[PDB]
Amino acid sequence: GHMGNAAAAKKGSEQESVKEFLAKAKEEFLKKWESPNTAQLDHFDRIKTLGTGSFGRVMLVKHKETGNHYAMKILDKQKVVKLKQIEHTLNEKRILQAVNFPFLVKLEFSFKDNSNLYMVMEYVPGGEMFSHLRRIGRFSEPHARFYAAQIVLTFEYLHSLDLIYRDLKPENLLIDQQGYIQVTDFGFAKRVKGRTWTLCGTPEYLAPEIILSKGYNKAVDWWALGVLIYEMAAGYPPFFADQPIQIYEKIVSGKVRFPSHFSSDLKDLLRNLLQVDLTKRFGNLKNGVNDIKNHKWFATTDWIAIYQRKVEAPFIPKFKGPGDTSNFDDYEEEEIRVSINEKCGKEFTEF
């Protein structure tokens, strides 16, 4: 076989240890999910906008009492109601409260006021993978692999809790002071025991079954991992066009082309992740995540060492101080206006 019978026994013991870990992690998650830390806006100084989206923005804030810096996501309640996003915003808060994993951003506070919802999370000063990747062009395969391994372990954790993530992309992956990945933006994360039906995500990263309005499962995250690995190693994603409709047509087609510098091991992995046929997609078969973890492209990956953060990272962001924003791009700064009248109170009773 590929492994001697001893190496095979080591791998087996390793896989049983994973099951033991995930069983404990489920017990801890459920304790928090059933029986869940507020603050208020004037407890923080607002420093700088770190990112912007349809419903609001993320701001660097400084907690007045402690001097700690955080990233505060601000959502305009009226804009959230205007869409099927009420449920999604409640999903994000509830999931972030309850999960615990080294590569998942930690939520510190949440609160709401007349106009907005607020989630205050750990500030990750190394910046988005997105801007490092766009600056350097593409990551070498070892560098991409180090990040990919952290996503594989994070999805193994989330999926074991019946959580789908649904928005993997470099924009949502921050680099910490040790060069490891922090996954952010749980706005589309959801507890799903079997299938779900919402058309949501980011065009370049959507699995075909989402685009085709089919009920879908956690395998959409494994497709998205294929897109991410391709983009990290190529510098651009596999289904690449100026308009969403053109992107969707490429995704459904069942065709991918690879740069000539991709190793054959990488291409083989990607053909099995970017697999339209769900009966053949890695991560969706009888052996589950182990088809990915045991793939040749990951043969050098020490999964436990990655989890334990023992591996030297390929890139350490420059860090000048705890509130330094030099690794983030600039955004237009807008006033944070709070209405004197409560908006959408009944819709957000549970937040």
């Binding site: 869409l83 949501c200 980011t202 370049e204 690449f240 066009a241």
Partner: peptide, 13 residues
Amino acid sequence: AGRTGRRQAIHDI
């Protein structure tokens, strides 16, 4: 030719 800037999520197709 494709999108090189930050990509926004979609809530409906």
